Paper text:
Glu-130, a ligand that can coordinate iron at both site B and site C, was substituted with the non-coordinating residue alanine. Two structures were obtained from [name] [name] crystals soaked for 5 min ([name] Fe (5 min)) and overnight ([name] Fe (o.n.)) in aerobic Fe2+ solutions, respectively. The structure obtained from [name] Fe (5 min) has iron bound solely in site A (data not shown). Iron was observed bound to site B and site C in [name] [name], showing that Glu-130 is not essential for iron binding at either site. Remarkably, mineralization in the [name] variant occurred more rapidly, with an initial rate of 40 ± 1 μm Fe2+ min−1, ∼10-fold faster than in wild type [name]. In ferritins, such as human H-chain, in which the ferroxidase center functions as a gated site for the transfer of iron into the central cavity, the mineralization rate at lower iron loadings can be interpreted as a measure of the flux of Fe3+ through the center to the central cavity. Consistent with this model, partial regeneration of the initial rapid oxidation phase was observed in [name] [name]. Thus, Glu-130 plays a key role in regulating the flux of iron through the ferroxidase center, and we propose that it does this by coordinating Fe3+ at site B such that the rate of exit from the ferroxidase center is limited.
[name] from the marine pennate diatom [name] ([name]) plays a key role in sustaining growth in iron-limited ocean environments. Typically formed from 24 subunits arranged as a symmetric, hollow sphere, ferritins take up soluble Fe2+ and catalyze its oxidation, with the resulting Fe3+ being stored as an oxy-hydroxide mineral in its central cavity. The di-iron catalytic ferroxidase center of [name] (sites A and B) has a nearby third iron site (site C) in an arrangement typically observed in prokaryotic ferritins. Here we demonstrate that Glu-44, a site C ligand, and Glu-130, a residue that bridges iron bound at sites B and C, limit the rate of post-oxidation reorganization of iron coordination and the rate at which Fe3+ exits the ferroxidase center for storage within the mineral core.
Numbering used by the authors:
A (entry chain D), B (entry chain E): 2 to 159
C (entry chain H): 1 to 155
D (entry chain C): 1 to 157
E (entry chain A): 2 to 158
F (entry chain G): 1 to 159
Amino acid sequence: EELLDLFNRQVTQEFTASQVYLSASIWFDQNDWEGMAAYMLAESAEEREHGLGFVDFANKRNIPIELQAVPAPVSCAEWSSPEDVWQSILELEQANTRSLLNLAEAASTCHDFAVMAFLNPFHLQQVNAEDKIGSILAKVTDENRTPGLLRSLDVVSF
Amino acid sequence: EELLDLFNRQVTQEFTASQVYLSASIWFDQNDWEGMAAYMLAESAEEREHGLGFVDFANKRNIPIELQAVPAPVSCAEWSSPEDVWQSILELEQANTRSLLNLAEAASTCHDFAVMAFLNPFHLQQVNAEDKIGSILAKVTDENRTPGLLRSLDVVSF
Amino acid sequence: SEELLDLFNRQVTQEFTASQVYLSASIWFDQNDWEGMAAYMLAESAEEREHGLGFVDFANKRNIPIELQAVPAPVSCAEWSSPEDVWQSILELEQANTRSLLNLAEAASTCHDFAVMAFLNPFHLQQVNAEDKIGSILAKVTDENRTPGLLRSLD
Amino acid sequence: SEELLDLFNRQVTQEFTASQVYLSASIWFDQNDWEGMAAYMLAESAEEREHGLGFVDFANKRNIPIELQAVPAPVSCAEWSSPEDVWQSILELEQANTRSLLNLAEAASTCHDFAVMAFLNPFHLQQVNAEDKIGSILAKVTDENRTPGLLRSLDVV
Amino acid sequence: EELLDLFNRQVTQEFTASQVYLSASIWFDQNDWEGMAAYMLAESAEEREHGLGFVDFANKRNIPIELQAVPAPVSCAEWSSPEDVWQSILELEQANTRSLLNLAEAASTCHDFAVMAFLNPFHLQQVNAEDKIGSILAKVTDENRTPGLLRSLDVVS
Amino acid sequence: SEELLDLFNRQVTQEFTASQVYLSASIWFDQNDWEGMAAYMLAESAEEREHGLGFVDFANKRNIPIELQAVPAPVSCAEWSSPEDVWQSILELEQANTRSLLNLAEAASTCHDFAVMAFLNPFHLQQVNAEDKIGSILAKVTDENRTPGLLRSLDVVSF
Ligand SMILES: [Fe+3]
Ligand SMILES: [Fe+3]
Ligand SMILES: [Fe+3]
Ligand SMILES: [Fe+3]
Ligand SMILES: [Fe+3]
Ligand SMILES: [Fe+3]
């Protein structure tokens, strides 16, 4: 079953994203962006919570879950500035949205109304996540035009 | 794109509805039905809030909103009793409902799960609204069979 | 449209039917001195009645004619002889409850009745939880009843 | 004795029957935009079910075997055309409810079943109150319904 | 009466300004200036409240009100930066002020003391509004001389 | 010190690996209607992840570069068929967690890295408590499961 493999994968995607968020916190912390680091860390925990929510529903609905490996984050090796980090995070959220939409498609094809109902809050959370990340990225990109100015986004606002 | 156009039209319909409700408040106040007036004023505000909720979601989801003219209400030229006003308000809500349904249809066809999730509470609200306005119109039509009687219940209820 | 309106009317019957079966289970348990299991069944009986009354309220608001049907006599109680038999029947009840909701949602879907489908969502998720809760209780009951008297300690 | 046990089972059914009849009254009232009277009937529907539950509880304690019967479909609601028709059916229902409790009490009395007679006492008094209140409402409805629209006033109370 | 047509006009002008504020909110939100967007959204609501205030007064004083179309905001098509938006909003407020002054003019010629009294707080509100928009626009125009810096006005409020 | 810097990195991986193993135990228990044991495992999964994050934080402060590695898929779950099997695996996991900390501490001792040793101290004591508590639960489980049904009683009662 496709629906069931995709549900598994979704758990994996949430934990993958949690680890990518953690990688972002690390790069920020190492480069003394403690505000952006705390934001990424908080998002890491929340992504893990989403994974757990998927796990709990699957268990209730007798969808067998077998935990997969959580792949090592790869984009950190390339990051040179906060702009690069926030852009990777945007891509991560876009990919998170795409995987949920694929899972919803499979559910819709199966007439699985319970799964579709379960996913609705996630669909709306993704809209809010891509908007928030996108907006932060816009701010960072604008402020990084003047040397040192972005270092005030961090200290003040986050 | 059909879903962008319909999403924009939904915004217009909410604000059109807001103005129609305001027109109703005005007719009521000018004819000394202050309770019925207060109710229409409350609704006018709430319809505008729905509109703002659509705009907010559209902004987040990158659906470009271009605000359109809000047309002049016209039913208020033909009103001559409260019954006429409540009947037009029922028909407004029926058109608000139809319009949400067209939107949902477009989103369904596009497999736009986030838009469909967003609309759900509005579908349920429209059930409530058509029911509440139907009920008031029934009461108005019944009480208006005895002279003076309708007036005694603007003054009490509302 | 006719099919959707009659399935909605028959969902009310299903909810009340399930209420009565829960009540039946409560009775068997009380008669056989399982007051803890009887209390649980009595609470679910009230809750299934409330679900019915939710369906009724919604139909009234959406102008779906409701005509209340006979609520059938519960019949599994004639054959229950252990708690296990009762909880197995309640599990079957919930699985049937789930299928009737899914059929209704299937007819709404066909009719493009977005409002009805939205109404049903919380109920689909409630049935997921109900089947899981019942299934778990039955697993426990089945395991504990392997030793004489032990199940009496769960109650 | 057999007859007493029969009648006790029956009473449970009668309570749940009346619960459904009150629900049918709520429905007709809601459908016809009498939300106040519909609220009233809904609350009574709940209450009748609680009475039935109290009989089941007692029977279980006293080892009167109960076996739940079908709850018949309400029938009056097909022919109601105005609130007067509904309140009239509900008065009859309560009148019927009183008769079955009195019959059950007769059977208990013949058996010298003092515990059953004691259990029934608060219900006999509740039935007096119920018939009084329903009768009183029916009287208002029937009076106020002589002026078009005036009964809609009662409902907003 | 010109006095009556101008009073109706004024309602349309308050609602037009509400819609124009809403269009500025949208442009800001779409361009990730969430602080400016919130500010414009609150002003949109307040202009609607002013309109509603004129409507209520007109009803009380038997000034027949007939609601006009609220035209579509047009400046938003050409905005490219926050400076452009704020400049349009200043122009809206200036227009808002002239219209109130024209209404007061008509009221004065008619010796309509009640309308003049009703308008007093709005005249003083407009002085405040022009001053406040003018001051934000001066900050915006100054800060936008250094790339990124304006993005700090938004974030700090 | 590269040995030190690698072992520290590997310790993060070990804490997150343990987090996932505890999640897998939680899942087994839930699937098999042991909701009390499943809650306990879930709690422990969060706690191990917290330890991992504490090691990350200290590394960042101390300029020990952390590069996150793959967190391996739990595999003991395939073999579990009773709660005893699950708790046995979790004992062995903790024993492994203990050995990894001790090896890290050895490396820090060789390097005279007093700050790393001081940092590890609370974890060494936590590991004593952890092994003791899992070992104790495993003893109870093993005893109660000698009578059919009895172990259920103590998922539902206790936990
Ligand atoms: Fe997520
Ligand atoms: Fe609306
Ligand atoms: Fe149910
Ligand atoms: Fe009764
Ligand atoms: Fe103004
Ligand atoms: Fe650890």
